[PDB]
Design a protein that fits this description.
The complex is a heterohexamer, with two copies of chain A, two copies of chain B and two copies of chain C. Chain A is mainly beta. Chain A has no helices and eleven strands. Helix content of chain B is 0%, strand content 32%. In chain B, strand 3 and strand 4 form a beta hairpin. Classes of the chains: A mainly beta, B mainly beta, C alpha/beta. The complex binds ligand TTC and 2-acetamido-2-deoxy-beta-D-glucopyranose (4 copies). One 2-acetamido-2-deoxy-beta-D-glucopyranose (NAG) binds next to loops of chain C.
Chain lengths: 118, 107, 563, 563, 118, 107
């Protein structure tokens, strides 16, 4: 119900990326699936992958082996670990909340931007 | 996968006009067609689920009339607060591709 | 009319060196062991082998063998190539249709048979059915006569017999050989080969030849064989069979020594001074081929009716298990299951086609080398005779029974779409079986192949695995499966107007997805088109597969090693 | 040691009237046509028929046949009853194990074979494999010798042979008959029957008998047959086989006339003045029966390895088609499809079980009438030899391959529950097939039946029709189906902790039903128990079905008409 | 949403029975399934059978061949025709409205009583 | 079919008491267990759907706590307006059998 990101707004290319979405007003182990989105400059949205409420996860097949989503259940966090980051995917990142029965991206984060340069 | 071609990549309308945004699908979605509305500097607020329903927090002007592949959104007599970037999404398959996203303008 | 030959080397491996001799108008006999060339030389003189494998010449009355030689001579295969499911009159009318001239009268076709069946002594069994395992008929001793009559239509002067005694009893075979002796004086040159002969047989010949391990040991008239082997160093002991004493020489009471005796044989020297004097319509072809297999089809209830009983009973059992498929959450499972089953059954019943051709393979070989038909005439006739009716019926028995008991979509056109789709899938699975069976005399092999094959195809039919959820380097295999197209067509035919969530109209909106609350949602989730082309795309795919597999069968029957 | 008999009437239909004679220690021959009693009298003197069908007596040295007669005499069947997949040394050790005394030494079991294999001339082929179609081995002329050695272990004084010449070549059979002639003087009474004999065979006999259409025509020594039929009115012509001239009398160059001649035969009168002077351990049984079929199993890659390779491929193909079953809306279809496909596959390989008993039926009949084993020893040994290993392996090959590729439930116990369930369903389908195929020599019959039963069982297994939605007068048939219990157990084993609506936790509440959003909802909707007894109820049902079908097989093998 | 019955509160035995449920505030061809219930004296409820929105119908298997439900769509009516009525099933009859997705008897009639005597 | 045995056919409670009405099922219902409340002379008003949810128009006192076959209803501190005849229903199968129906009393 209430999401928010907090992470580095910059990174060296081809190493890694870490983002963290802390969920309040609701427990990420209770009901929903939790996914990430990125929106490039020259705005085009691109859903990245969701972690289920029970740790299971499915990732966007364009991002294979590069994205991983972990979770720390004891404080309602889920982590975006994006490795071997090219300078091209310097998009604005979001965490979002998916109902499953309603089927839509019901809730969204605030919006964190990642710039991949040197 | 399923690509959502918003063939009208932009528009140029005026206030109090009925604008019709198409969203041509590359496959049958069966009313699994969401509509968002991204004001600049914000996350996409959900506008219409199910391609015919509506989301609480909007006037009864946005209305989706879709069938098969030719889904569309009708904005009858749009307001000043309704210029944005409307993205149509399929939530039928897993790779939830969005639309290109049209962008309204004022002449 | 005489036969003659000289310096024959036959390889694939030379199980021969060279055979020299002539055959007079009379009774020509070939004897020896099975490993010898007694069965290969006869195929040489009847031109039943590869000419490239042949080396020497075949000179007839100062003329080589033309293309017309096979069309005016008769070779009889050792097993019963007759239609025991038919009668003698019907089968001899068949053999008269494809050998006598088109100009000749049907009265002449009535008379020339009666010049022969009267000669064979088969006037008692003219309309009597010849005989099957499941239909009692004439004794086999006259099945042999039936085949011989089949090879005496246009009055061939040159007769060839593949082991006229094996397969018959002693006095049974004597009645065949006395008939041939009657033919031995009517200007008919009979050339044959007998394994383990007898002196009652041996006392009526005119010319004799012995082969052993591809080596020639005798030539000339039959009486002097006993006269010659005395000079070889032996003596026929008191009360021994002369034809068995001729094999007493063979296996040591060595081969090179006896052959060297034959090289210095005066019987060979006269032949050396003889040989070197010598060496020095389609519509009609389809009018009667269809009828013969049609009467084979009628004259076998245990294969025709017995496959209708299974069709009727299984038509009714499936009518009782399902019986009014409900439009509830279980309706999808039942409709897909039955469509599944009807399609799988068609496919798997069509592994009986391998029977048609595999059993009729040897008859096809002999009849085409005789020249009864063009290969396409056989191919457009037998498919008209067995592929057409035996697969139009179950596609109607299933269709009429299980449609209104189950309550499948109550429209006029959908009933016939299902009828035609089952007909096409029956044809297509039979056509494959026809492609994978053509030119194979073994049954257990092919049937084994067809069986795995369909078991893979069903995995891609769409029920046992969702075709959209296969790795993309396997999703090209979903096109090589006959049970996919028919099953897709049936799912398209039936799941259009249906609903399966009672109380929940889903066609306007489907709240709470993962539900499958209409026929289209199940149909799309299987990866099946909803446009009306999506139905008949399967039919054109199946029609192309029929034509392709029938062409592969046609080429296998054309490029087959007939020799 | 002599045989004797008097006034034998044998019916089911009396194809006999009465046969009188004695057989001296020597070479006793029975000749005639196949329709005659030449094959039935030999089964009479070897006690291979129904005693109630027998009428007269069998008197041996002034004593009737005891129960010990079959345990000290040897009858050899016409076809090769030897283990061509094994070697002579191994097979003769088998026949030494079950016939020699338990007290006798293994050194004596080493020596007594070497007193016989040395006699047969089979010292070259002692360790050479005898021969199969797919494994090159010894020639058939010594396969005959192999069987004879199998029937010479405990030194039986009375030998019986079913057609010692049929199935062999001429000089091939002479080497068998000269070996028997060597046995003709060592105090061994050989009694046999030959179809179409020869004078080389005829010149070495000691006593002769002729049968025709159930009528006796000769008795006494073999030389005087030619001497007697001269007085019947015939004369053996110049250079004719005497053994074939003896059948020249039969079929008219009538039966009652020749029999009346025999009634007034002096050869019969001496026999009339002779006959009326006369008429006036289990652990060891399982120690070696298991080994023999075990070496049959090793000595046939085309049936043992060829049924592994396939399992291995399919396990890989099924491992590639599914490969990590997703927990989404398509997951139910894939998991149920694969579980269905596995259960079905096991049932279908079970259909080759018939090939075990149907092929080994004639060997079983001969070996039990000889008394090599109790029926339960055969039944507890062969199942230990072929039912156990050939079905433990594929239930492990499938289990090891398709489990971790597909990602079936990642627990330790569920892996072994699936392993054991596939093992049990393999056993149960094999047990049903074994009961159907017990006591049937035909393959095409049962194989047709087992396929029919299965195609009906599968219609009830639970995938093609929802079992709760069947009319209540058919829902009792869902208990007679092997593919139901194994498939139910697999669905119970795998669908417990699963979920199939991603993003929708359903175990607390399932909003919007008609959804099947957890494993339990699919499992209950199929009519399957959720209690842990619901899993092992299937296993105890399958264990009871194994025991019942094996008992039906045991009774069919016990109450079989061995005669 | 608004149901009401109107029919005879009495009947001769073993002939027939007619009840009519007129639906206002909603159209019976639009969404729901429409079923009948009866509650005996000595109160025990007994659902009788539902007619779907598209004319399809399923009846309680205890009442086979005796109950039939028809519908007149042009005025939003569905009819309960109960034949060969024994004097024992003299229950209080209702028409009710079933959601399908919610799954419960969301709406009910007013309550008509049928007495089967002579 | 599925018979719903409300083994406590009646009760005798007082105001402000937590009463627990059982509803033993003859098969797995999987939270498809409805609760009604028939005041005398009325049709059964729906009380609880899904065996754990609640229906708008009631206090937060009626609460279903069911699992498997042993479904039950808890009324914490019942009121005067809550005496009635509570019927539990299965809507899993088609023959929607109700419960026998308990009936509260006042001592
Ligand atoms: C799934 C199709 C079906 O069950 C059906 O509903 O229609 C009939 C039928 C079926 C499967 C099989 N057969 C049939 O006649 C024969 C068959 C042989 C199979 C063999 C070879 N047998 C000789 C054991 C295999 O090795 C593996 C799977 C096999 N599956 C089958
Ligand atoms: C069986 C089960 O999972 N029960 C859980 C419970 O443990 C948990 O306290 C509650 C809220 O988190 O949700 C429910
Ligand atoms: C069977 C039937 O009439 N179904 C209707 C359908 O025509 C309509 O499109 C939908 C709109 O909500 O409502 C429902
Ligand atoms: C496809 C379909 O059924 N569409 C129907 C339409 O015909 C009807 O006018 C409307 C209201 O009744 O509901 C919807
Ligand atoms: C996997 C998981 O945590 N599932 C929970 C379950 O514990 C809880 O019982 C249920 C209550 O709604 O919500 C969901």
């Amino acid at each position: 119900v209430q999401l928010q990101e907090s992470g580095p707004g910059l990174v060296k290319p081809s190493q890694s990326l870490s983002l963290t979405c802390t969920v309040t007003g609701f427990s990420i182990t209770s009901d929903y699936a939790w996914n990430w989105i990125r929106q490039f400059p020259g705005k085009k949205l691109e859903w990245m992958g969701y972690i289920n409420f029970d740790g299971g996860t499915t990732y966007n097949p364009s991002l294979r082996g590069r994205i991983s989503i972990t979770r720390d259940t004891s404080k309602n966090q889920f982590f975006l670990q994006l490795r071997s980051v090219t300078p091209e995917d310097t998009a604005t990142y979001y965490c979002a909340t998916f109902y499953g029965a309603k089927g839509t991206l019901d809730y969204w984060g605030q919006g964190t931007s990642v710039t991949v340069s040197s | 996968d399923i690509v959502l071609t918003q063939s009208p990549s932009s528009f140029s309308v005026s206030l109090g006009d009925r604008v019709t945004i198409s969203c041509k699908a590359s496959g049958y979605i069966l009313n699994r067609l969401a509509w968002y509305q991204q004001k600049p500097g914000n996350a996409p607020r959900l506008l219409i689920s199910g391609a015919t329903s509506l989301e609480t927090g909007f006037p009864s002007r946005f209305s989706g009339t879709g069938s098969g592949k030719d889904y569309t959104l009708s904005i009858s007599s749009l307001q000043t607060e309704d210029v944005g970037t409307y993205y149509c999404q399929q939530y039928w398959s897993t790779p939830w591709t969005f639309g290109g996203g049209t962008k309204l303008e004022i002449r | 009319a005489v036969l003659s030959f000289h310096n024959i080397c036959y390889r694939v491996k030379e199980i021969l060196s060279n055979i020299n001799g002539i055959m007079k108008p009379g009774l020509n006999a070939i004897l020896g062991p099975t490993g010898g060339g007694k069965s290969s030389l006869l195929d040489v003189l009847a031109a039943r082998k590869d000419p490239s494998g042949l080396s020497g010449d075949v000179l007839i009355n100062g003329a080589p063998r033309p293309a017309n030689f096979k069309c005016n001579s008769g070779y009889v295969v050792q097993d019963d190539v007759v239609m025991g499911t038919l009668t003698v009159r019907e089968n001899l009318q068949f053999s008269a249709a494809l050998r006598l001239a088109t100009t000749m009268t049907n009265h002449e076709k009535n008379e020339r048979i009666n010049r022969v069946i009267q000669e064979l002594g088969l006037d008692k069994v003219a309309d009597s059915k010849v005989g099957t395992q499941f239909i009692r008929g004439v004794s086999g001793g006259e099945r042999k006569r039936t085949s011989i009559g089949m090879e005496l239509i246009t009055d061939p002067s040159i007769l060839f017999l593949d082991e006229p005694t094996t397969g018959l009893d002693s006095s049974t075979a004597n009645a065949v050989l006395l008939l041939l002796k009657r033919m031995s004086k009517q200007g008919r040159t009979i050339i044959f080969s007998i394994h383990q002969p007898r002196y009652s047989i041996f006392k009526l010949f005119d010319s004799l030849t012995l082969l052993a391990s591809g080596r020639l040991m005798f030539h000339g008239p039959a009486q002097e064989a006993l006269g010659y082997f005395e000079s070889a160093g032996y003596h026929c002991e008191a009360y021994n069979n002369p034809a068995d004493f001729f094999l007493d020489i063979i296996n040591g009471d060595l081969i090179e020594k006896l052959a060297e005796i034959y090289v210095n044989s005066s019987f060979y020297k006269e032949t050396k001074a003889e040989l070197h004097q010598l060496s020095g319509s389609f519509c009609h072809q389809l009018r009667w081929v269809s009828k013969r297999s049609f009467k084979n089809l009628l004259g076998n209830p245990q294969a025709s009716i017995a496959q209708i009983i299974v069709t009727v009973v299984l038509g009714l059992v499936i009518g009782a298990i399902y019986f009014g498929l409900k439009n509830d959450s279980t309706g999808i499972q039942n409709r897909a299951g039955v469509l599944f089953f009807l399609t799988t059954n068609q496919c798997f019943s069509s592994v009986s086609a391998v029977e048609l051709f595999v059993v009729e393979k040897k008859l096809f070989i002999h009849e085409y080398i005789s020249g009864y038909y063009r290969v396409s005439s056989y191919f457009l006739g037998k498919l008209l005779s067995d592929l057409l009716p035996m697969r139009m019926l179950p596609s109607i028995i299933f269709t009429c029974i299980v449609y209104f008991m189950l309550g499948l979509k109550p429209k006029a056109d959908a009933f016939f779409v299902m009828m035609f789709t089952l007909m096409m899938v029956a044809y297509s699975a039979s056509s494959m079986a026809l492609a994978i069976a053509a030119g194979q005399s073994v049954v257990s092999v092919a049937t084994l192949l067809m069986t795995i094959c369909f078991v893979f195809m069903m995995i891609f039919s769409g029920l046992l695995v969702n075709l959209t959820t296969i790795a993309s380097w396997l999703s090209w295999l979903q096109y090589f499966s006959i049970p996919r197209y028919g099953f897709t067509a049936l799912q398209h035919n039936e799941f259009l107007g249906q609903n399966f969530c009672p109380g929940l109209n889903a066609t306007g909106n489907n709240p709470c997805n993962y539900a499958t609350c209409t026929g289209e949602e199940y149909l799309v989730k299987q990866g099946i088109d909803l446009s009306p082309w999506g139905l008949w795309k399967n039919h054109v795919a199946l029609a192309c597969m029929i034509v392709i597999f029938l062409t592969i069968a046609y080429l296998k029957l054309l490029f087959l090693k007939k020799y």
